[PDB]
Amino acid sequence: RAHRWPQPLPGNDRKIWFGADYNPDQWPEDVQDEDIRLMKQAGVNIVSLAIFSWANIETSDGNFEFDWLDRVIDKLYKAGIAVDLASATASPPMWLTSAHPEVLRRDEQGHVIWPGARQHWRPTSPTFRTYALRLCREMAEHYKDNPAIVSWHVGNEYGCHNYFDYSDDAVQAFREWCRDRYGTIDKVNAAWGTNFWSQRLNSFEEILPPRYVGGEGNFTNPGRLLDFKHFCSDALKEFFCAERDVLSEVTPNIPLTTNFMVSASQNTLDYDDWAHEVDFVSNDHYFTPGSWHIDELAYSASLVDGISRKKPWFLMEQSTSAVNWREINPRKEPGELIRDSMLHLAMGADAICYFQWRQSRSGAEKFHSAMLPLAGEHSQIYRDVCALGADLDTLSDAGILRSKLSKARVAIVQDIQSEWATEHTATPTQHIREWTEPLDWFAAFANRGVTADVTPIHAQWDTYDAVVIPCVYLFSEEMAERLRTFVRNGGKAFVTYYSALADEHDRLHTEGWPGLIGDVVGVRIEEHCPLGTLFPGMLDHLDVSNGTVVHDLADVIDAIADDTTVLATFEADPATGMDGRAAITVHPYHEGGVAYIAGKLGRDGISQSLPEICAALGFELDADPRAGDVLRVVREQEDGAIFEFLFNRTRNTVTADRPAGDMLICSLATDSTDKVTLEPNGVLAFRR
Amino acid sequence: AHRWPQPLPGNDRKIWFGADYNPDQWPEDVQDEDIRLMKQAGVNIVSLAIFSWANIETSDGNFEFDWLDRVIDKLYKAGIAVDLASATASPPMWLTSAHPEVLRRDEQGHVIWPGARQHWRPTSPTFRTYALRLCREMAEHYKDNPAIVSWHVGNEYGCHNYFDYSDDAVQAFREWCRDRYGTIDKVNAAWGTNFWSQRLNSFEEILPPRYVGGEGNFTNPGRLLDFKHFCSDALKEFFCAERDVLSEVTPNIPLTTNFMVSASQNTLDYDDWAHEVDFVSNDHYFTPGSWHIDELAYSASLVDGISRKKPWFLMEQSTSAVNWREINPRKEPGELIRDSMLHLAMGADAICYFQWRQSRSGAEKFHSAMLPLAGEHSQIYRDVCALGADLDTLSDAGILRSKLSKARVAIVQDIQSEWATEHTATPTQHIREWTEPLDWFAAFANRGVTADVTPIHAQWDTYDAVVIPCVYLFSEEMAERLRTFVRNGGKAFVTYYSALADEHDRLHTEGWPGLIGDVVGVRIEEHCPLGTLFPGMLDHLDVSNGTVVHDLADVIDAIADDTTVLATFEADPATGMDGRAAITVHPYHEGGVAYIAGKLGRDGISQSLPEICAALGFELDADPRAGDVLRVVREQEDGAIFEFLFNRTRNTVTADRPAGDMLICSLATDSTDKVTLEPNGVLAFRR
Ligand SMILES: OC[C@H]1O[C@@H](O)[C@H](O)[C@@H](O)[C@H]1O
Ligand SMILES: OC[C@H]1O[C@@H](O)[C@H](O)[C@@H](O)[C@H]1O
Ligand SMILES: [Zn+2]
């Protein structure tokens, strides 16, 4: 679609948007003036409202009431505050689920999903779609050409709860999805391997979604499962498009977005694909507690930018402190509030918003942090939040808008479909999923002072000096060609275990692994060597000769090309048949460029190997560990203005080479004329 | 309205001592040996027919009493009283087969089938009909039979069937809400149903909290709280109906039902049920390991608490192993007698076991009894006979109707707060209310102080000191009670996770503790949960006095000017916790408030207690030995004092001898100077 960013309200300029989900309909209206006074003081200029306000709008069937929403929207507009307005179709009222219990989702075992939480609806319910499009229309009509509304928030995190439906509506939809994608039943049969275990289909009507097949010790069809995960994503996407189609039909000036859930571990929605149906990309992200906090946020924001194809994106949600939804919910430390928002910013967001504005007293999210805590305006959270708005106006005025995150030296390929494939319960080990490997390489590259671009698989990683292929389990013929070309012409590639095992339908490649691509990699593998502690005396690690250690899984490399060089070998009990086998290799292919990594090494084993491997490939690398102490993230204007952010990645005070330019921002950090000083959780930004 | 069961025609008053008794599982030719062996053991009551429904109403509407008459006659002739059940605990196969609509449904709509017990819907009109009929039939048939000294109505209501989601549950829960709230808006307002489009147009839209999709999903916290309240109230209404039918036909016979008070029990509101029984009776089974002693003393204290210090009846406990855990350990030598003495010392006037004769078959076949499968030549039967003897001695020494003395400190227990801390969207699933009171009780025991565990509506505000441990719900009134208690000179220990929400689970605003910050002197803007969920997570916080907080800590932002800080957190500065306040004490008029800003554990509390108490002005022996023996004291109106001493340790201990006559000793040695207890020993004196 074409890129349409939300624009300012009639009269004032373009700013970094800074706001929050806002839910006045959970408080007495008399609170709305205080809300707005405190927003202004904070630097807040947009809020998103009505996201789950369905049952306070269509108060009963066919009956729409807009007064309370009309009143508060008026107060916000008069205050200079924009409205990112929802469809309010995210979750239905009790009256509707009562009259039509047929809209309720069904899990793999046919359990009914009742109301009492949210999103208890079947994505492909014809009835739910009807009520829903009606509300979308009603809303669009009523706020047509109301000028406070600068954009639409259609629904809410589609599929967060209702990805997997197994109801009769879903059965019907998965059938037709399969007909539309495969054409003939023979082709479905051939993609799924249905001659195995007498699963062969006589017709499209015989096809079932992968409902319960009896638990542990039972193994559902993997190809059918892969496709079903694909269908689920597309079913929700289709629903979204029908809703957006209705909203811009009535108010075509207003750009539409929906809020994604990009994080290192998200493993449902195919968001690179969804991104093709939004005027701008916006994301919800919540910090991962502990050591992974920083690298995993950077990773996710980088990825978002990747899906955005380096266009500006909108951080719709993140948290000021604790979430509510983990089994343990830690608070943020001093500085992390500001520093996290800065990271999202540095990775290309032109907007920064939280869930939520005012902490709820009751309901299931009552313990989720907000900008204004229950403790009230005399709280450290609110003080930090005010500081943030202030820094975001500063950045706006220095002119950062619409600058793009710069092109890294190395692309790290992330691939959701591979993630799905690696999820089957009959793989060589359940201890290996695709999602962790890209994250480790990103963390490892941060350790050596190189900030990578996380890039989805259909993006242009083949225009980078180097790419990481980390457990890209599905390799199609085309994917194989793309990598072969990238390497022929001087590309340098890092390829790992669990890469290129199967075609795109989860049919394993023959003649040895990596499949399709073995000529380029220079390595041949006849089987895996999974490792663990399931049973007493099991082989549970493999030492590597460079002083690292592999866990969970290793490849058994049988032969290498004559021009393949071994950098590292496994060191083990000879009887294991792994002693002296190749663990890390590098192999020339024309002008490039391939290192193969035959096991899971983790952030730190990757990171400790990285120097010897980069040297072998001709990738310049700082070999000093200090090099990773600060993470440097850069945005570039076409006019040549450069915004460089520095972040302490460690738990001790650090000193960095000061960039040239003007200091725009500082949190837990000290500028000097020579060198720059950051405390833990501290951030700096300069314009050059 | 306290009615204790009385002796049979002719007998004197004795500590009751018996067991569940189930002759309907054996050939009648075994009964004379049962009774014989009972007499040798000192047994003077049995409870029978508790699950004998299918052997009484053998088929629909057919009631048969001959076997029960025969055995009750042998028992009567032998001098053994009968605590007779309604036998309505669990229905026959013919009933559930004819009427499968009585069957419970779990949150996912699963039928709960027969094959175990208590598979019934609490609010099944059909089942209620059958049960109340049987109740009547029993009552009719044993009207004015002098063998029957009491009624055992049903059995452990809600042990299995607390949570029903059937249509009967759906309907009753509506009506329960209609009645508790009046108008649908008061509901909407209690539950915060404007969040996530939950707002209700009517009562007919209210549903019980059935499955909303497992992990990653979060049901309405107020609706869940109230549903837990409802589940307890539904079973209670049912019990009252059963007892009403019984006491109407035989009004002279006192009625009870058996509770399951233990540290971690978390369903029935028992303090609330205690209002519908003629005497309070409890089932308790030991917690294996270290916690064996303190967790029994705590549970028994709490039952007395619920009884408002009136005598209570230990209906069930075990001689050795239970059957129902994943590992079922046996009791060690001495624990059988010592355990019964702990319950006695905490105010019980009856001591009975599950069960009399170990079963050869059925699901409880490996559950221990008084007469083991090994037979009469067993260590368990030998100890039982000794216990029987000890209890006759104590009856003769005049212990009956003595009350447990008023301790210096009350420890507040609150089932409704436990229900609240159970919701899956709290700061951490690692914190529940129940553990904390238990830690403080154990902690005082470590310092030679025996506390009274008290439910929230009991009179803790008449003690020198009260403990408020994870009392997450504070109503306005609760807040006023505490304020008054401290103003008028009471001293209070308050912890983290206290006073977060009103009674509807709605968070207090303006900072925590809510409502009560004027009295506590501390202001908290958010929590700092700790754990190991993810690598590098903050998983503990040292405290400056040498203890350690785990699981959860409060972030104390400000303290009142007259607040004194006793200990601070010590952390990595980047955490924003280093040097923060961890234990504080604060004057409020004539009391009296110490704040403990995290989970310390038994040992952390115990190690801090001296300093806290000194600052509060509560005398405390600073020596660790002080907790080597637990002293529990019962007092007669006439001035008689019964003092029991118990070894809490695993090595021999020596204590000051009480004055008076020595009544009982197990694994212990009276001397004229000082007393000697072995591991697991108990001693008793009258003074
Ligand atoms: O952390 C909680 C938040 O998670 C967001 O992704 C969701 O869209 C918000 O409504 C809120 O639920
Ligand atoms: O410990 C085993 C016992 O548990 C009791 O609570 C129950 O009422 C008895 O019948 C038996 O099941
Ligand atoms: Zn089920």
Which neighbouring-strand residues pair with B493?
Answer: B467, B594
Which residues, by Cβ under 5 Å, contact ligand 3, an ion?
A 109; B 108
What is the Å distance from ligand 1's center to A438 Cα?
25
The type of residue at B306 is I
| Residues A457 and A473 sit within 8 Å (Cβ to Cβ) | no
- Topology, domain A1-403: TIM Barrel (3.20.20)
Provide the residue type at B261 as one letter.
Answer: V
First to last CA, chain A: 33
Q: How far is CA B371 from CA B27, B33, B72, B341, in A?
A: 16, 11, 19, 20
The answer to whether A375 and B511 are in contact (CB under 8 A) is yes
- Three-class secondary structure of residue A562 per DSSP: coil
Query: How many angstroms separate the CA atoms of A44 and A487, rounded?
Result: 48
Contact present, A127 and A166 (Cβ < 8 Å): no
Q: Locate tokens 């829903």: which residue? A: A132
The residues of A assigned a catalytic role are 157, 317
Ligand 1 and A157: CB distance under 6 A: yes
Give the strand pairing for B629-635 and B403-404. Answer: antiparallel
Please name which of B405, B403, B342, B401 lies closest in space to residue B14, comparing C-alpha atoms. B401
* Fold (CATH) for A627-688: Immunoglobulin-like (2.60.40)
Q: What is the dihedral of CA B66, B67, B70, B72, to 10 degrees?
A: -110
A161 secondary structure, DSSP code = T
Sort out which chain B residues have CB atoms less than 8 A from A118's CB and list them: 196-197
**A414 three-class SS:** strand
| Whole-angstrom distance, CA of residue A17 vs CA of residue A39 | 13
The shortest CB-CB distance from B534 to any of A91, A111, A290 is to A290
Out of B214, B535, B537, closest to residue A330 by CB? B537
Reported in sequence order, the residue ranges of B31-96 that DSSP labels E, i.e. its strands, are 45-48, 57-59, 62-63, 81-85
Euclidean distance between CA atoms B209 and B225, whole angstroms: 10
Q: Does the CB atom of residue A434 touch ligand 1 within 6 A?
A: no
Q: From the CA of A211, how far away is ligand 3's center (Å)?
A: 12
Task: Name the nearest CA neighbour of B79 among B125, B39, B119, B127.
Answer: B39
Among A52, A93, A361, select the one facing B192 at the smallest CB separation. Answer: A361
Interface test with A, best of B430, B526, B541 (most A CBs within 10 A): B526
* CA-based nearest residue to A253, from A122, A387, A143, A113: A143
Question: What are the distances in angstroms from CA B598 to CA B191, B435, B470, B601?
Answer: 29, 13, 10, 9
Q: Decide: B412 and B467 in contact? Cβ < 8 Å.
A: yes
Q: Which of A191, A188, A225 is nearest to A507 (CA)?
A: A191
Instruction: Give, as one character, the DSSP assignment of residue A528.
Output: E
User: By the 8 A CB rule, do B608 and B583 touch?
Assistant: yes
Verify whether the Cβ–Cβ distance A369 to B526 is below 8 Å.
Answer: yes
d(CA A301, CA A349): 8
B681, exposed or middle or buried, with CB in 10 Å at 0-12, 13-18, 19+? buried
**Nominal resolution (angstroms):** 2.6
Ligand 1 centroid from CA A259, angstroms: 10
**Cα distance between the two ends of chain B:** 30
Query: Of the CATH numbers 3.30.110.30, 3.20.20.80, 1.20.120.80, 3.90.1150.10, which one belongs to the domain with range B1-402?
Result: 3.20.20.80
| DSSP string for A255-308 | -EE-EE---TT--SS-HHHHGGG-SS-EEE--PPPSTTHHHHHHHHHHHHHHHT
Sign of CA dihedral B105, B108, B114, B117: negative
Distance CA B79, CA B200 (A): 61
- Return residue ranges of chain A for CATH 3.40.50.880: 404-626
Ligand 3 centroid to Cα of residue B210, in Å, is 12
Strands (E), B153-265: 255-256, 258-259
Delimiting residues of CATH 3.20.20.80 domain(s) in chain B: 1-402
Contact A161, A268 (CB under 8 A): no
Residues from chain A contacting residue B199 (CB–CB below 8 Å): 55-56, 93-94
B555 beta partners: B526
Q: Which of B156, B418, B433, B643 is catalytic?
A: B156
**Inter-axis angle of helices A222-250 and A185-192, to 10 degrees?**
120
- A59 interaction partners in chain B (CB closer than 8 Å): 201
Output the residue whose Cα is nearest ligand 1's atom 7: A157
Fold classification of B403-625 is Rossmann fold (3.40.50)
* CATH number attached to the domain at A404-626: 3.40.50.880
Q: Looking at B104-220, list the stretches that DSSP marks H as alpha helix, in order from N- to C-terminal side.
A: 125-142, 167-181, 184-191
Task: Return residue ranges of chain A for CATH 3.20.20.80.
Answer: 1-403
Chain B residues within an 8 Å CB radius of A364:
195-196, 218-221, 423, 425
CB-CB neighbors (< 8 A) of A23 in chain B: 194-195
Minimal CA separation from A615 to chain B, in Å: 31
C-beta separation of B382 from B191 below 8 A: no
Longest pairwise C-alpha distance within chain B? 79
- Which one, of A641, A4, A16, A81, lies nearest residue A345 by Cα? A16
**Contact between A522 and A561 (Cβ < 8 Å):** yes
- Site to substitute for ligand 1 among A355, A358, A367, most atoms within 8 A of C-beta: A355
Cβ contact A94–B200 (<8 Å)? yes
B118 lines ligand 2 (CB under 6 A): no
- Distance of residue B418 Cα from the nearest chain A Cα, in angstroms: 17
Chain mean position to CA A470: 16
8 Å CB contact of B213 and A53:
no
Q: Count other C-beta atoms under 10 Å from residue B182's C-beta.
A: 10
- Run of H or E residues at B17: strand B16-21
Contacts of B129 (CB under 8 A, 6+ apart): none
Residues of chain A in contact with residue B196, where contact means CB-CB under 8 angstroms, are 52, 91, 117-118, 363-364
Shortest distance between the Cα of A180 and any Cα of chain B, in A, equals: 30
Question: Of B214, B511, B533, which is closest to A326 when you measure between CB atoms?
Answer: B533
Residue A369 Cα to ligand 1 middle (Å): 11
Place of tokens 């299931």: A364
Residue A35: both structure tokens together: 């809300």
Between strands A82-86 and A46-49, the pairing is parallel
Contact A355, B188 (CB under 8 A): no
3-state secondary structure of A61: coil
Radius of gyration of chain A (CA): 26
Question: Residues near A462 by Cβ (< 8 Å), separated by ≥ 6?
Answer: A482, A483, A485, A486, A491
Hey, are the CB atoms on B427 and A322 less than 8 Å from each other? Answer: yes
Measured between alpha carbons, how far is B181 from B500 in angstroms, rounded to an integer? 22
Whether A679 contacts A650, CB under 8 Å: no
Token pair of B144 as six digits: 């004015």
Tell whether ligand 2 has an atom less than 6 A from the beta carbon of residue B156.
yes
Q: Which residues of A touch B209 (CB under 8 A)?
A: 116
Q: Please name the member of B198, B217, B525 whose beta carbon is closest to the beta carbon of A94.
A: B198
CATH superfamily entry for domain B626-687: Golgi alpha-mannosidase II (2.60.40.1180)
CB contact under 8 A, A374 and B509: yes
**In whole angstroms, what is the distance from residue B275 CA to residue B239 CA?**
12
- In terms of Cβ atoms closer than 10 Å to its own Cβ (0-12, 13-18, 19+), residue A267 is middle
Give the ligand whose atoms come closest to the C-alpha of residue B285. Answer: 2
Is the distance from the beta carbon of residue A322 to the nearest atom of ligand 1 less than 6 Å? no
Which neighbouring-strand residues pair with A560? A523
- Is the bond preceding residue B265 a cis peptide, omega within 30 degrees? no
Q: Is A211 left (phi over 0), alpha (psi -120 to 50) or beta?
A: beta
For B596-659, the DSSP string reads E-EE--HHHHHHHHHHHHHHHT------GGGGTEEEEEEE-TTS-EEEEEEE-SSS-EEEEPPS
For A432-488, give the DSSP string.
--STHHHHHHHHHHHHTT-PPEEEETTS-GGGSSEEEE-S--B--HHHHHHHHHHHH
Number of H helices, E strands in chain B: 16, 28
> Please, is B578 exposed, middle or buried when counting C-beta atoms within 10 Å of its C-beta (0-12, 13-18, 19+)?
middle
Query: Cβ–Cβ of B194/A26 closer than 8 Å?
Result: yes
CA dist., res. A576 & res. B463, Å (int): 71
Question: Which numbered atom of ligand 2 lies nearest the CA of B117?
Answer: 12
Cis status, amide bond into A373, omega within 30 of 0: no
Distance A355 CA to ligand 1 centre (A): 6
The CA B346 to ligand 1 mean position distance, Å, reads 50
Distance CA B151, CA B360 (A): 27
Q: Is B367 in the pocket of ligand 2 (CB under 6 A)?
A: yes
Instruction: Return the CA Rg of chain B.
Output: 26
Under 8 Å CB pairs connecting chains A and B tally to 220
Test A362 with B192 for CB contact under 8 angstroms: yes
What type of residue sits at position A342?
A: M
A260 CB near ligand 1 (under 6 Å): no
Residues sharing a CB contact under 8 Å with residue A231, sequence separation 6 or more, in sequence order: A173, A174, A177, A178
With beta carbons less than 8 A apart as the criterion, state whether B164 and B118 touch: no
Q: Where in chain B is the domain with CATH 3.40.50.880?
A: 403-625
Q: For residue B120, give the DSSP letter.
A: B
C-beta of A263 in contact with ligand 1 (< 6 A): no
Contact criterion met (CB below 8 Å) for B208 and B220: no
Q: Whose CA is nearest to atom 11 of ligand 2?
A: B354
Q: Are A313 and A304 in contact (CB under 8 A)?
A: yes
Pick A362's closest partner by Cβ from B506, B524, B533.
B506
Tell which atom from ligand 1 comes closest to the C-alpha of A51: 10
Q: Which segments of A183-221 does DSSP mark as H helices, in order?
A: 185-192
Question: What contacts A2, CB < 8 A, 6 or more positions away?
Answer: A279
SS (H, E, C) A335-392: CHHHHHHHHHHHCCEEEEEECCCECCCCCCCCCCCCCECCCCCCCHHHHHHHHHHHHH
Q: Do B528 and A363 touch (CB under 8 A)?
A: no
Q: Is the CB of A317 under 6 A from ligand 1?
A: yes
d(CA B240, CA A13) in angstroms, rounded, equals 71
A604 Rama class: left (phi>0) / alpha (psi -120 to 50) / beta: alpha
